[PDB]
Each structure stands twice: as structure tokens, then as C-alpha cells.
């Protein structure tokens, strides 16, 4: 009576041994005609993993990936400028991403189903996303993973008590944020790019604009923090012949630079005085409400669509002083102009207007239904056949979406069922080995064997010193043979035959010549793993300790063909397996009387 | 890479449009203030 | 020759597969008369897990839980106000608990036995406690887990070099601390509660008292930080008609508010001047020593019981100035009054006096011996029978307490034995699935089957499309059948029969109708898992690919009864198993000639 | 068809069960003459683990350990004073080490092969090192793990884009840093030791020197922060009769104390004025460049060997004022003196000069090739025999070194091969149980059995109540019997025989007397585990429920001898196994007719 | 919930007792100081 | 433990050598400054 936790789930090994159960506990029960679902031939990988390592993009659906990149870009900007609790727990820096080691908050809103998986086979942001998805609300997971709701009535809205706005347009935000070469200024809020060792032209012109509004006292510290002098010299710009700024809001030609000062620089440098029609302004709150309203007048209705409660007025009051130092309240009421108050979260609302302004000049992104995010209905899942359910639960992580306390949560499907919760939907993530989805590996394998015209069974030959696999094929195969044990002989044959073929299908290299020293031990392992009774007679003849290898039952065309026909869905399958495993069968037959 | 962000050109078109709207409203503003200045200089 | 780490301990899976070994590797060797120990039918769960998720309380012993809640409440207050190293590594906030991501300190006092378990099946504070218990001193574990020493000589004291005081009385500290609705003031030390959107009456009256002692300059910032104006308006209190405070310690009617100012507010606001009999006080250390001694005179002896070295005097010296600005040392010596000096750690000693004052007005908490904390003596453990040891090591985590370098440590029992240390005691934690202890699940299962009057063995019927389990029962059972393999046929029968019954005993739902598409594959899996030779003859008849299922040996009353009688402790047991598994046996017999 | 991740790698259990596969899946295929490689009989353990717990040193090679201690000491000082990114992520404090909970940075330089191992069986710094080695560059791993390149052409240099200097000399840095008793001053940069409750003599004399250069205003705060008054009183030193310092750089007798002030104290205390030949110095940069150059003149060339670009000049310019307050630039040019500029990282370069100065007065450390760090060439590995490869992959963690993007990385060897990367070298770490390398345990076991003169096979005896193992031996053995199941009878015998002997070889204690209550269940478990058909006839005779145990096939000298001869490399081996397992075989033969 | 912390009533009883003791000692204090003030006003 | 750090004696030998070199260079310095002072007191 063995201990319990010993049947590891399909989910806690390394890659090679996670290939072994596919090869021994999915593939031998699939008939060669079995069609793997096409949606399962790609898998989800988190955009961060791919931006840092583009090779990981290979197993993903490109159109879902590009969409997720642009979507994450937007969601991150919203969250980062929000004063509300951050949904992200990573920091995007120049050239790298930090996972932040946030305290584990535990509350009434934590998923009441505990997660018993570690997911150490997945790329680190993909792994990180899953940990969040299974411990938190499904809303948070979708937001951080750059989910876009696909077109159609069969996309499911998730219950959550609070939500951010949902903007959707193509953009390059992540590529700009992750740009490696930036000035490491004490203010991190403005990521001034370095191009060819010099501050970028776009950023230089911007900073030159902002500089005009800094005081005479603070300009040195500014110029130093961004190396403006070198940039000016490189760009030919004589700083001494820059004009005085027009500090009057009425005749100022663009508020862009004043808004940038307020957005990134007010909290570190002193500003010059700002005027309205000759009168000095008394409140920066009024300056920022005026300038934003004037600059983004056309987007104010669209802001109100997300924030109905936001104050919008047909006028604004500016508290000013005249040159004679008398307090003058100026009420500004221009034809067909509206003024919005953004004071309680200026940094967010300024950035939100920029997102809206870009959206109005970008196309919206369309996506198909994601098996990872949207999944399938629980009834649709339960309608499937027993082989499909075995295949899914043996090639994908399997999740469910469920509701509790008016919130949607995600958990492993078994655990929802065990906690007596009812799954609404089943979500899937096809597992990956050697840069392919395992589902697709199986699909390709079945297709390839199915496509082979049947060859003759190999005839007994002399001195075959290879099984046709290359060095890297042979070494993978040899590791797998060490894992093949105690199984019924007939099945052990089919499993080893299918292992060889699954490797042979990716095996680019010239055949590997088995070293003479290894040759007998290889023979032993191969026939023992297949469940043949290998018998090694050591006979001392004179001074020499001769080892003779006897294999029973005898390897013959009839024995193998009969043994595979029992374990195959048809005779054709058995003959196509024989055809695909030709080199191995040629080896075996040639050494059976050794 | 500065040369190969296509958005650099979208963003220029975006800024031009925003500054254009902003310039329009700044002109409506200065026109209203001109009308008001002339009437105050006579009231 | 397979790899080593493949026999996963009873401790590293998910729940469903951790039910499978109970059902296949404990339950078929227990006779129906086996009595599970009653202490093992509940289990320990950390109070924090339960305060946030009350459902987790269900598997615990209520009287140990309520005790632990009150005890943790006390221990946390001591530790939090201590200037010594924090034994807790969590922060209790309003509505939630943060696990703090503390640096992993490693020292000469770290448990010299390494821990090789992760405990991902346990609630997060329960898991967290175990990690600490196994890596640190047993003293720390008991303190943070709210252990109370039970009445009796058989409670083991643990060696540790330093210890906090051990107070024990019923209280509601945790419910107050975890109260979700509080003003988010810049000073976090005073958790002012919000009730119906307004600061609580008790807190308002308190803060109004404290306010009297704040300076005219700082009152605005105070009133703003706690929204006193709204609270005053709501409570009808005219702030302008509050009286001037009596700032003379001699005629001051209560020191309560002055002490609160010193405890929560001195570090953020300026105080008014304090007087003694007309003379201004020069030192706050003297003010706090005087006021505390006068307020808590009756508890001073009880403080000395925990802190013998604390200075207690029959007089105190107050350094003062007269109105004429001459330094006057006043020696105060009142009949039957003693003065304690708490300068070392005023914040701790003020809070400690409050705990003592509450204890003097609360009952002490009594608890029984905990199998988790106190365990059993190692000799008592070794005196047990071989089945009990198998049952314990297959239904509980098993720990030992041992001494090294004059400190008591706890480690997994195997690892103490392997490190050649001698266990003093064995401590147990019954594992949990589906909201029950597994020990109790087994106890209930055995009882239920034992209680069944024997029915007739089912007769062969037509068109049975269900095994009597509901949908959720059937799906749990179906998952388990996919795990059942390669076992001796007779045992494989008893294990599958016991699996069905263990599910059937919790299976509230109407029977699930096996879909026609699934029906043959279910038949195959069921008989194959039981180790019957299932033979599926595919015969092409005309265009139709007919599959005929042949099961050997034939399912008959004699075959099953004989097969179960071999694997059962008595004939009665076999017949009670047949009786409990009636629907399944009716299915089997009805499809055996299909 | 069971799930995949269930053949746990040789790498995810606890210790006892990780002994079981050695005993059942390595040892029964080794012939008694097999020579374990000597390099594999020790293993690497991280110096920090051993400095805190000296017992862990036992499995290590002493000469590699002492070397690593001295090397880490140097590397840490370099890294700690570096302004570049820290390669270490631990803090060495007095008496303890903190692992710092650093953000997980992920970048283009992260190892593109993911790590699927957790290594929870290794000491915490050893485990921590491996996590870094497998996720980061091999350069970082070698630096933090105190690797020293061994003498010889077969030591591989690792590609990395940037490297620290590589100094190598014997030292005691780690013992000084980890010294438990130090003043907890607000400045942590100077770890003033406490000896017998008083500040150390060496530190006292040092601080007294430094004090001279502190201003009259700051001396009180200094004297308080280091408790100088008590130290002075204890050391008899009258502080009032200390001389005025010679503040003129020309006639100052040692710059040691001024340099120490600049190194540890300038950032917290005001200095007195410093003079050159009567003129006041204007820049601390010039003071530190002068004093260092004068103090360490002989090491300047050696600094230039590591830092060619560092400015070295035959003169220096000191900006000064005369007593008449006129600015005077003094150019100092002394015969055979050179001046180095260290301003851009003074703290590092001051500490680097100290390391060089100690190296010039210490011997260099020599080490042999490390199987952990240097490993073997991949071709040399591939040249090995199949049993050696099985033994290595069953007793060691197995790693490979590979190149990508002009950087060397380390990963598990399977994963390099699976990612289609080519390993350059194979690196090994022998796993440890019960304070020995497993490799060595096997070596010792094989030797011991081989060395036994053959005894007679035991004769059937009455009332044998023990198997010769002690209590602790018996209880380890009994756990192992619960893990022995379903194996072929002949092999199950050899495996249980080898388990007994492997325990018996470390079993110091007097035989354990099997309790009468346990005796039948032990008999059952032992013969069942060995794959004997145990048959337990329960016969009710009168009121008594008699259990008779029948074992088949019958235990006889011929049966056992024949059965072991099948599974042994020679007859001699079978007879030496019988000889080593004598007590167990005496038990078995004495209970076979029970 | 303010209504349903039973300890609110224990705690009121606790404060009443502490303030009662405190008031007693404050009276013993003021009585001692009264005796001392009267004797100082005559010494 | 102060008595049983052998490096205390290596380190004393190290300081002695450093202070010796330092004293030598301080003397070369004061000699150069003496030559320069005497020549300045006559130029």
C-alpha cells in the first residue's frame, strides 16, 4: 500500500519526462486518423515573455499576440497612472521588466478555492499570470494579460465589483517603454531616449520647450539632469538665442509644453509665472483645467462616456491678480467650448486624454475567441467524447470559470468540481515542449505516420551499429528507454515504437554510431524496456568472461506484426508503424540472435 | 529604434491635429477677448 | 531501473489524486470495524484563514479555535509594540492581512534540519505557520499560531533562549483590528472606525478628548486628518463650546486622553503645556511615568511579576518650573501609591497595562491537549500498532519535537530520525479534502458500510444507463477510474468498489445518464481499471464497423463474491461492500455480455 | 493510461524515499566490484551554509572549501563597494546572513532555457546559488559561489560581457564580517567589535585616531554612537590628554585615520580643516587623491593592471588658500612618486588598495578542478559507459555549460539537449543523505559487502524477535518496506536484502525487539514486499480468531541462493549478500513455517 | 459592527473602574497637596 | 575572538609596512618642501 501524492499530476515534472507520458499514455490509444482540434495547436504566452524573448512567440497565434501587446500597453498606462490599487505587480523599465515582490494580501475577495499548482514549466510572466488568475478575480487576470473581448455574443463578461475603462487600439507603447537606451535622470517619469549616444531629437525639442517655463534658478539643475548642453551642441541649437516664452495663456501658441511641465516636472522644478490677458494666475489647478479643456475640447464627451460624474461646464472661473495686485475672478465662457475639472487625479486624466487622442487616430483591434481566456461552455465540454476528455486533460492545463459573492473567479477545473462549485466555462492552455504545442506535436506525428506508404518489413542484416537516429535523437531516445519499465510486453513494444518515431520525426542529424563498449547494454535496455525476456549468459571460457544475449520470445516479422496488430486500431496502422520505425526494426531483427 | 517606430508619423499627425484644434480655440479665445477689450475701452 | 524521487510523499499532489491513495492505499486494508481516533477527526487551521474565510473553521475543533483567536489577539499586540525582533511576519490591516516578504535571515539558531515539504494544499496562513515551525524554534511557532498550554502535567515546555510574557484571557482584538471601515489617516497607529459613513461615537468622543491637549497651531491638521468637523456636526457637538482642558495633573479628572495623546499622537502633533499644582512640567518621561502609575496603581505588582527588574518606587521626582521660572524639583510621595518607570519602552508598557487591565476584567481561556501542538510522547507513538502507524503516516502530516543547543525545534519525523536526532514527541495534522478531515471521511465511510443491512446481489437487467452517481459524483468517479491501472485483478476490484462507495456517500444528486457516445469507452475503462481482460472485437460487417465488448473472467455473483471475500476481513464485510455498491454491481452484471 | 508528470525526476522527493531508489534502482544493478569515481565522493556546499553550520562541511573537499571561503570574502568586498549592479543578493550581518528578496529582473540576458527544478533538498545558500546559476550567466554564479580557476589548461573561461577584477589570496574576511558581537551604531559601515562587553582595542585605537579629525560640535554624537567614554575608561586612556592632531598633510605622521574618516565617517560627521605646508586645502577630492597616492605608492602599477584607463600622473594640483585668503594652486611633484585619481568611485578604490595591500602580504590560493564548477568535456562525458551514465544521472544533479549571444550559461543537461543547444561541458553535484554523498555511501556499501568472508547460511531457530537492526535502523527499514511493492519476486528479494545491508552498515545500536503486537504484520509486510505469496488463514476456533501465516514459495537455502544467484553478477556476490544479510535471513527462515 | 462587539460593554466597565481608581488617587493627591499648601501658607 | 585571529599579526605587519612607506614618502615630501622653503626665503 504505496503513498498518495505519488501519481504526480500531468503538471509537476520536467520536459523530457513530460514527453514520455504523451508518448506512452496518449499516443498509443489514439488511432492514426484522430483529428486534434486546431484551436489547441497554438497556445497562449504572455507578451512580456515574447518581447524579451521573441522565440516564445512561435507557439502562439500571431493575431492574438499582436493584439495582446497593444492591449497590455494601454492597460499598463491606465493602471500605472491610477491612484487606485495597482492591478499590475511588475515594473517595465528600459530593456528589462522587474517582477515586484509585493506583499501577499489576503482578504474576503481572495479566490476561496486554493491553487495546488506551481507551473514551473511556463515562461515567467505566463507562470506569474496563472498564479494571479487562480488566486484573484478573473477580471484582474484578463486586465493584466491583455485580454481583448472577441466579437460575438459568446464572449463572457466577468463579475467584479470595480473595473477600469476598456480602450482598444493599435499602439507601440510596450516597445517605447522597454527601449533600453534612456538617460537615467533622477526623475524617472520622463524616459528621455538616447540615440547614437545623444538625447533623441523628439525628446530634445520637447525638453527645450519645457525648459522655457522653468525658473532661472532651476534651469542649471534641469539642463544637467538631461544633458541638454551636449544635445543642443549636437543639434546645432544655440540655447542663448531661444526666444522668451509667451507666458500668457491667451496668446501662448501651444499648451503642449506647459502641460508636459505640469505632468512630469512641476514636482521637481520651479515654474515661471503664468498670465491670462495680462493678469497673473493664482491656481495651478485652474491653469491645468483651462489648458487641458482647450487642447482636448473634442474628446470631452468621450471622457464623460467613461466618467459620467466628471464635472463638465460651459464656463470656468480663473482667480487672478491684475498688475495692480487686486484679486480679479475672470469667468471664461467661449462659444462652443466646455471645461472639465480633472484636479482629483490630474496625472491620470491627462494620460487618459492622450490615450483617447491616439485612439481617435488609430484602428481598433479585432480578435477571435481565445481557448485560454474565453474557453468553451461547461455543457459543450461535457458533451465531448471520452477520448477528447482524456486528450485535453493529458495535453493542456484545464481551468474553469465560476461565480461566488457576485465575483467571477478562475480555478483548476477539478478543484471547482471538488469545492462543489459549478463551472460556467472550461478554459484550456496547451502545454509546450521543444518550442511546439504538444497537441500540435501529436497532430503532426499522427499525420506523418498516416501519410507513409507501407514499406516491406526489414530483413536481417549484419553489423548494424545505429538505429538511424542522430546523436541528439539517440540520446533523447536513450533517456526515454531508461524510463520504460514493467509494462505488458505487447504495449511496451507499441510505446517504444511510437517513442522512436516521435523523435525520428524531428531528427535532422546523420545516424549515430553506437560505441562498441555501450552496444550490449543498449541491446539489454531496449529489449528489457519492451518487456522481452532478455537473458544474459555469462560463461567463463578460459580467461575470458563471455556474455551471450538471448531474447525471448524471438523477434520475427510474424511476432512483431501480430503484437502490433493487437495494439493497433487497424492492420494498416500496424504496417504504417512498422514503416515509420523501419531502422529500429532492422536493428532489432539483426541483433535478436546475437 | 527612432527610424522604425511607424507610430512616430501617426503621432506627428496626432500632435498637428491637437495643436490645430488648440490654435483654433486659442484664436476664438483671443477674438472674444479682443471684442471684450474694445467694448471695455469704450464703456 | 526507474528514477528516485518518483514515489511522491503523501504530501505533494492535488486533492483528487490525494483522495485516490486514501481509497486505494488505506481503505482496502482497513476492516469495517476499525475505529479512527477521535482527536484526529478535527484538524488545526490558522485563525487568520478562518477570520477571512469562516468555512475553513468547519474542520477545526471550535473550542481550540475560539481560544486561538483570543490568544493570537494578545500575542500580536505584545509583538507589534515590542522593540525586540518581531515574531510575526504578517500585517493585520482593516479588512485584510498582508504577509510581509521578510528577508530570509539564516543564523546559528536556524533549525539545523532542512525542511523538504511545501504544503501547497494548506490554507495560506496554515501553510505559512508550518514553514516557520519547521525552519525556526518551536517557541516562535507556538507564539504566532496562538497556542495555549492545556491544563495538565503532560504539556511540554519548549526550550528557547528568550520569551515574551504569557497572558491568557478572552478578547475580540482580531475582530477590531480586521474591521474593514476605518479612516485612512496619515497616522496609522489609531484605527478610527467609520460607522454609517461617519467616524464612530466611541472614537469621536476619544479624539475630542485628545484634541483639547493639541496646540492651536496643529488643531487644523488634526481635525482634517480625522474629519472631526463632520463627526461633530453629525453628533450635534458644538466644538466652539467645548471647555478648556484642565492641564494641571493634580486637578485633571482623567489622564486617559493625555495618555492617548502620548501613545498615538505626540510623534505627529504639538501638545499644550502640562502643569503640576501650578508649576510647569519639564519632562514628558516624568509626565508619562506619573500618569500611568496613578491610572494603573493596582496592576503595578502584576507588571513586576513579568518584569522583576522594572523600577518601582514609593515616590517620584518631577522637574518643574514655578511661574517665576525657577527650577523646582517636586518629590511626590502619596500614601499607598507606587511609581513605575517605563521609559525603556513606553509604547509597549502602556499597551501591556491595557492588556493586564482587560485580563483583570476577563475570564482565562482553558483548552484541551492539541495533537498539532502538544502531540503524543515518542514512546506512546512507538507503542502503537502497525496499522495505526500506516493510517497516521497516510492521513496526517507527521512531525516531531527535538532539542538541540538548548533550544526545542520541530521537524518532519522522518528527518529527525534521519538526522540521528531523538524525537521527544510526535505531533500530527490530519489532512483535509472537500471540507472534511480525511481521517473523519474514513471513519464515516467505514461506519456507513458497517451499518448497512445486507441486500440481495443485483439481478441482470436491461438498458441500465447510469451507475446511480449524480453528474458530480460520476465525474469525480470517472477521473478516479483514469488513475486506476495495472493492479492485481482481485485488489483492483476491491479498490474500485470502495472508490464508488466513498463518492456515493456524499452524492446528493439524481443519477447521471451516461451519454450513448461515451457508453462503450466507460465500459472499457471500468473493466480495464478493475483488471478484467476486456477484449474489443472490431468486425467490419458491410459498411459498418461493429465493436463487440467481451469481458473475462465473466462477471457473476460467485466470481465477484469470491473475489471480494479473498480481499475482505470477513464474509459479512464482502456482503456489506456488495450492498453499498449495489447500483454499480447492477450496471456491471447487466453489461458483462454486451 | 496514467498522467505524465508522475515519474518524478531523481530530484523532487524527501531524503528517505530518495534513499529508496538508490537502494532499489542503482545498487541491485551494480556488481560488488564497481568503482565509484573518487571526485564524486565529496560534493560542493556553499561556504555560507558551512560558516553558520560547520557540520555541512563534512561532505565537502576541505581544500576547495577553505579556498571558497577566502575567495567569497574578496568577491563580496568588491561587489559591496562597487557602484555597478550587485552580483550578490545576500547581506552578511553580524552573526547571520540575510537573503535579500530582490525583484526578479527579466531581460535579454536571462538564461533563455527555463529551470524546472526547485532543489529543496539542498542547504539554503547552496540552493540559492543553483537557482542563480541556472537562470543567470555562468560568470555571475562562479563569482558569487567563490569559484577559483584551478591550475591547468583544462579550466574553461566563461563568456560574459562585463567582469569584476579577479584577486586571489588567503584571508579571514567572512569570519570578521559574521562576528556576532558589534556595536549597533547608526552608521553600519564601520562594524566596531565588542569584546568582553567593551569595544575592541584595535577598533578603540582606530576610533580615537579618527575622533581627532571630527569637529568640536560633532564629537559628542560620535563619542555616544560608539560608547567611546566607557572604552577609554576601560583602556585607561584619558581623552583630555590626547594631543591635538597634526592637520598639515606635510607633517601628518600617518594618513590612515584621515582616510578612515573619509571612508566611513565623512557622510555623517563634520571634519576639521586640513592644511598643506600652512595653506588650507579647498577640495576633499584632492585630499583623498593625495593621501591614497602617498600611502599606497607601491601598488599604483598593480591598480593600473586591472584599470588601465585610470589616470596616473607624475604630479598633482592642490587648490589651496594661504592664511591671507588668496587662492594658491600648489603643484606637487616628488621624486619617484605617482598620483592616481580615484574620485569617480573613491569608496571602491580605497577598499581595492586595501585588498591589493593584503594580497602583497598573503599567499595565493591553489585549487584542483571542481566537478561542480569545471566539470568534464561533453565528449569525455559521451565517451563513458552506460552504467556510469545511469549511476551519474541517479546519484548527482547533472548540468551543462553552453554559449548563446556571446555569453556562457548553465542549465540542466537534458534541457540544453532539448533546447537543441550544444553542451560544451558537463558539471556534476553528488546528492547527499544522512551527512554523506550518495556516491560515497554506495562506494562504502559495495566495498564492505565485497570485503566479507562468506559465512554459512543461517539455520532455522526458535523465537527470533529481532532482525539485528537497532531501533533507529529497524524504523528506517520498516518505512522502506512500506515503499516496496508489486516488483518481480526475484528482484524484490535482492532489493530488500540490499536495503537491510545498506542500513545495517550504519547501524550503531543494539538489536530492536519487535513488539509481539506488531510481529505478524511485520512478517506480512516483509514477505509481501519481497513478492512472496503470503496467505493469512483466519480460522475461528471456539471464541478465538486464529491467524495462520503461510508463505509461498517456501523459504529455503536453495530457493534464496538460487533466487539471488539469478540477480547477482557472480555466485560469490550472492554468497556475500547472504553473509551481510545473515540476521535477516535467520529471521526469515525461522518464521517461514509460522 | 459597533452594535455587536460584546466587549464594548466589558470595556466601558473596565474604563469606569480605571477612571474610578484614577479619580481616587487624584483625590488622595489633591488632599495631600491641600494639607501641604495649608501648612506652607503658615510655615 | 581577538586572541585567535592569526591575521591580527599579519595585519600589524601590513600596517607597519604601509606606515613605513607612508613615512618615507612624507619625509621625501618634507625634504622637497624644506629645499623649496629655503630657496623661496632667498629668491
Author numbering:
A (entry chain A), C (entry chain C), D (entry chain E): 1 to 594
B (entry chain B), E (entry chain D), F (entry chain F): 24 to 66
Authors' account:
We obtained a palisade map at a subnanometer resolution, which reveals a trimeric structure as a single conformer. The trimer is ~13 nm in height and 8 nm in diameter and consists of a closely packed cylindrical base that sits on top of the inner core wall, with separated lobes projecting toward the viral membrane. We found that most of the density in our palisade map is unambiguously explained by a model of the processed N-terminal fragment 1 of A10. Ordered densities that would account for the C-terminal fragments 2 and 3 were not identified, suggesting that only fragment 1 of A10 is a structural component of the palisade trimer. While the trimer of processed A10 accounts for most of our STA map, an elongated density (~60 Å in length) on the exterior surface of each A10 molecule remained unexplained. An AlphaFold2 model of an A10/A4 heterodimer revealed that an alpha helix of A4 (residues 24–66) located in a groove in the A10 model predictably accounts for the unexplained density. Our maps, therefore, indicate that the palisade consists of an A10 trimer in which each protomer binds a long alpha helix located near the N-terminus of A4, where the N-terminus of this helix points toward the inner wall and the C-terminus points toward the viral membrane. Within the trimer, each A10 monomer consists of three regions: the A4-interacting domain (residues 169–364), which forms the projecting lobes at the apex of the trimer and mediates the interaction with A4; the medial domain (residues 38–168 and 365–431), which encloses a cavity in the center of the trimer base; and the inner wall-proximal domain (residues 1–37 and 432–614), which forms the base of the trimer and interacts with the inner core wall. In total, each inter-protomer interface consists of approximately 2,285 Å2 of the buried surface area. In addition, the A4 helix binding in the groove on A10 buries 1,220 Å2 of the surface area.
